[PDB]
Design a protein around this ligand. Structure first.
Ligand SMILES: *NS(=O)(=O)NC[C@H]1O[C@@H](n2cnc3c(N)ncnc32)[C@H](O)[C@@H]1O
Ligand SMILES: [Zn+2]
Lengths: 313, 79, 548
């Protein structure tokens, strides 16, 4: 019963979707979001409009002239400025009821107890190593974990919600339900050298493998494929594909040899889509209403596919 | 004719089961669906294996097995 | 920018139209610019409102009451003042958005929240020959699709849902659900404060055939003789009318009779959100009364004899309908509902959130691109699901269908058949309920197809006013007559074939095409006994059983 009349009028149309309880949950929820390029900016915008108690936006990187000349949290020409810091302004306008904080320290440098002021953590632009250290921390602390990224026309999200209790609506009201997630570590390292495995690999989007490739190019080069270095980057990609296919036993065409064309930079509409989905996964997670998707979402912006894969147990 | 159990799944992940005679005009099924679900008829679109199903199509014609699946897609018009 | 030679020049090259600037709207505008769409037209007929602020991210509380389109442009500009945006604040149905206008664009994108504007925009793009991407959201769902003259079906190739309609007798005599009471309260508001409308009387209907085997005073007239006195209106509606209903006793042979209410008795006898509380009768009564007091005032603030227009967001209009519906409800033994629920049902509020619109607007630009680089053959209808389907799909891309030859819009010489009584139906009813409202024309011209070309309706204000009141038979229209309807603005032409019928059921004025209750009801029991005599002999065409 205890949100303001102000909030009631602005959240009106969402309260009518998911009820006052769920919105009271959101309102009590604090969120860490790491990296504020295209995907990060969508999530920020989405969670602030939803009215979480607070959002902390962490990015240690600054605005480059390689960075998109248009960014909706960031007034023009703000090159040299901290990303998280440039952003804060437009972002906080979205919703004065939300506590929007920034942090400029590199995510790797962050102690365990720093994560415990957050009911959910979401990673964008992080190296695989980061993704694992943080997921593990969040497991140790019963924090909801997410990661996501956009690569040209593709995007993915990932979720680890541990032992997750939620209520659903019953189609003729409310049903208690439970669903169990597993570490990123176990999800990014599947034994395909199995019988279960090689059987299920038939039904598994190549995008899961496109992921691995892209995560590697990120670990070994510390940036994602840029476009005005296309030629250089394309080969590196073609290469990496093979070494990684080798190490679990996959025939170098089960992931097309042609992918390289459409995974460069970030396509603004892909950020919107994937940030729409991920943001909504997070909302679902905090309000403990509706089933959350079992670990991965893969979006293919050419085909208009969005697949949800359970990859880890 | 003979019979099959078919299942209709909704976007709203609902899941209604039906027993239908292989010779049936699938419109009868659509009508069956909208009734057990309270929705006016052409408020919907029924898909079998990514492909549309018109009123007079038949489970035989579409080559439908036991246990098969039909997907209903409702067109939102807000925004 | 990150798109191939041809395409990126085509995007800085072309002009695009985004019709509507709400949820899908703002989201789209942002994507189109960040994708590098240099030339963009933007139109919304509306101002900013607080309930918008959870999903229309270009607008802040400081912006309430300004134009959605203009503020939208202001806001993009701050982040990217390079971008070109022309911003119209206006309905796209406005005569200035003619075929010529649509012809400039390489793409039109809908961002609308109603079927009427979509039926119009569909038509403009068939006429200007321009691909359109259509889309829609509600709650957690929505979809995107492409429409291309000559290639795919058009918006209206397939009948969509119509707005829910209730039989007059059900509203005025025998309500049985809260929606009937709320529809009654809207109509009453309309009789008292809006444009009096005979199809919307709230008084009991003596001519109900369920009730058969000097005039009484109408609602507006009874209002006028009492000067809109709250308590007399109460007594009239919730008491004297009910007494009369009780007179119509063949109605209550099986249903529980309504119980009339008395003003003085109700005053003598006297978490969640505030609006989520159900109050008592007394309270509704008092709110009904206060609501009249305030609306009588709003009505005196009108300039030049004008009427109120009902609005869910006007407190006292909303209270009026809340309190009136709850009292009608009680009288008929239904549990009363809260303002929050009533607002929802009365306003037809659709739940809406940010992420759903963000996802849809994202899909719109992607399909845009495909179209703009000749990959129209890769375009799909993409559905957004709440949960993944059996083949693991959350977004389900689906095959475009081709133009339906019997489409009453996009076909070569489109043509419909309408069934009506040529003696009951007037020109006005033809004009508003059939041509404008059912066939969604904006300002029709209508003539008889008889080479004299007898005129019925003109779009030229005060040309066919005299004809309004005349029944169709006064022109010779009858079975098989053929009329020709033109909407010059939509560049659309529809021939209407009349089927005369006398047997429609006095609320039902038309429909589109395309003893012995002891014998013919005890015959249904053995037309069902015979229907499943052949079912249980492995020999019947159509048979579906529901399980679970
Ligand atoms: N779904 S929404 O409510 O966020 N957006 C709907 C959006 O579309 C505008 N609209 C509706 N009808 C018209 C016409 N006829 N012309 C121009 N714009 C129109 C709404 O005002 C709303 O903002
Ligand atoms: Zn058509």
């Amino acid at each position: 019963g205890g949100i303001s009349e102000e909030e009631a009028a602005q959240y009106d149309r969402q309260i009518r979707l998911w009820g006052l309880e769920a919105q009271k949950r959101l309102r009590a929820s604090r969120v860490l979001l790491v990296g504020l390029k295209g995907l990060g900016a969508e999530i920020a915008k989405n969670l602030i409009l939803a009215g979480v108690k607070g959002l902390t936006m962490l990015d240690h990187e600054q605005v480059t002239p390689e960075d998109p000349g248009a960014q909706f949290l960031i007034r023009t020409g703000s090159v040299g400025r901290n990303r998280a810091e440039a952003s804060l302004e437009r972002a906080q306008n979205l919703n004065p009821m939300v506590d929007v904080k920034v942090d400029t320290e590199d995510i790797e440098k962050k102690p365990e107890s720093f994560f415990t002021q957050f009911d959910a953590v979401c990673l964008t632009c992080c190296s695989r190593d980061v993704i694992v250290k943080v997921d593990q921390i969040c497991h140790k602390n019963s924090i909801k974990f997410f990661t996501g990224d956009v690569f040209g026309y593709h995007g993915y999200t990932f979720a680890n919600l541990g032992e997750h209790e939620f209520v659903e609506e019953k189609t003729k009201t409310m049903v208690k339900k439970k669903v169990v997630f597993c570490p990123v570590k176990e999800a990014l390292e599947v034994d395909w050298s199995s019988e279960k495995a090689k059987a299920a690999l038939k039904r598994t989007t190549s995008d899961y493998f496109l992921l691995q490739v892209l995560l590697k190019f990120r670990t070994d080069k510390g940036r994602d494929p840029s476009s005005d270095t296309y030629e250089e980057d394309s080969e590196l990609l073609l290469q990496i594909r093979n070494d990684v296919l080798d190490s679990l036993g996959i025939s170098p065409d089960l992931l097309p040899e042609d992918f390289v064309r459409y995974c460069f930079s970030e396509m603004a509409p892909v950020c919107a889509v994937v940030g729409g989905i991920l943001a909504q996964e997070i909302v679902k997670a905090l309000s403990q209403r509706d089933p959350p998707h079992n670990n991965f979402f893969f979006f293919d912006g050419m085909k208009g596919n969005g697949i949800v894969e359970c990859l880890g147990p | 004719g003979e019979y099959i159990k078919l299942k209709v799944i909704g976007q709203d992940s609902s899941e209604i089961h039906f027993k239908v005679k292989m010779t049936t005009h699938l419109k009868k099924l659509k009508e069956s669906y909208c009734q057990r679900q309270g929705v006016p008829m052409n408020s919907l679109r029924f898909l079998f294996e990514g492909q549309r199903i018109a009123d007079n199509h038949t489970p035989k014609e579409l080559g439908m097995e036991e246990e098969d699946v039909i997907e209903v897609y409702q067109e939102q018009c807000g925004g | 920018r990150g798109l191939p030679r041809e395409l990126a020049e085509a995007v800085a090259g072309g002009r695009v139209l985004v019709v509507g600037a709400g949820g899908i709207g703002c989201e789209l505008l942002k994507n189109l610019v960040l994708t590098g769409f240099s030339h963009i037209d933007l139109i919304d007929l509306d101002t900013i409102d607080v309930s918008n602020l959870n999903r229309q991210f270009l607008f802040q509380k400081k912006h309430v009451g300004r134009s959605k389109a203009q503020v939208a442009k202001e806001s993009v500009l701050q982040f990217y003042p390079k971008a070109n945006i022309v911003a119209y604040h206006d309905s796209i149905m406005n005569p200035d958005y003619n075929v010529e206008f649509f012809r400039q664009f390489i793409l039109v994108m809908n961002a609308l929240d109603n079927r009427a504007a979509r039926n119009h925009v569909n038509r403009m793009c068939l006429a200007a020959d321009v691909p359109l991407i259509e889309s829609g959201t509600a709650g957690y769902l929505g979809q995107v699709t492409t429409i291309k003259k000559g290639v795919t079906e058009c918006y209206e190739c397939h009948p969509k849902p119509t707005q829910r309609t209730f039989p007059g007798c059900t509203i005025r005599n025998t309500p049985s659900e809260p929606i009937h009471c709320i529809v009654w309260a809207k109509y009453l508001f309309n009789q008292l404060f809006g444009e009096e409308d005979a199809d919307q009387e709230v008084s009991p209907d003596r001519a109900d055939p369920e009730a058969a085997w000097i005039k009484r005073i109408s609602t507006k007239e009874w209002a006028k003789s009492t000067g809109y006195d709250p308590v007399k209106l109460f007594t009239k509606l919730f008491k004297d009318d009910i007494r009369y209903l009780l007179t119509m006793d063949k109605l209550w042979r099986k249903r529980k009779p309504p119980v009339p209410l008395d003003w003085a008795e109700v005053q003598s006898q006297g978490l969640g959100l505030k609006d989520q509380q159900v109050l008592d009768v007394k309270s509704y009564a008092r709110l009904f009364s206060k609501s009249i007091e305030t609306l009588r005032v709003h009505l005196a603030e009108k300039g030049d004899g004008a009427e109120l227009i009902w609005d869910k967001d006007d407190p006292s209009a909303m209270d009026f309908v809340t309190s009136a519906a709850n009292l009608r409800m009680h009288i008929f033994s239904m549990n009363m509902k809260s303002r929050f629920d009533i607002k929802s049902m009365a306003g037809n509020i659709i739940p809406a959130i940010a992420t759903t619109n963000a996802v849809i607007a994202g899909l719109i630009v992607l399909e845009g691109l495909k179209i703009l680089s000749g990959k129209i053959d890769q375009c799909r209808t993409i559905f957004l699901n709440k949960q993944p389907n059996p083949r693991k799909k959350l977004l389900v891309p689906c095959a475009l269908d081709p133009p339906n030859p019997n489409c009453y819009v996009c076909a070569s010489k489109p043509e419909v058949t309408v069934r009506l009584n040529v003696h009951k139906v007037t020109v006005l009813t033809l004009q508003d309920k059939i041509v404008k409202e059912k066939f969604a024309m904006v300002a029709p011209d209508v003539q008889i197809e008889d080479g004299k070309g007898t005129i019925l309706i003109s779009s030229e204000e005060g040309e066919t006013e005299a004809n309004n009141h005349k029944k169709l038979s006064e022109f010779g229209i009858r079975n098989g007559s053929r009329l020709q309807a033109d909407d010059f603005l939509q560049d659309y032409t529809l021939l209407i074939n009349i089927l005369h019928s006398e047997d429609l059921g006095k609320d039902v004025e038309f429909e589109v095409v395309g003893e012995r209750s002891r014998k013919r009801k005890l015959d249904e029991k053995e037309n069902l006994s015979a229907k499943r005599s052949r079912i249980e002999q492995k020999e019947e065409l159509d048979d579906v059983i529901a399980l679970d």
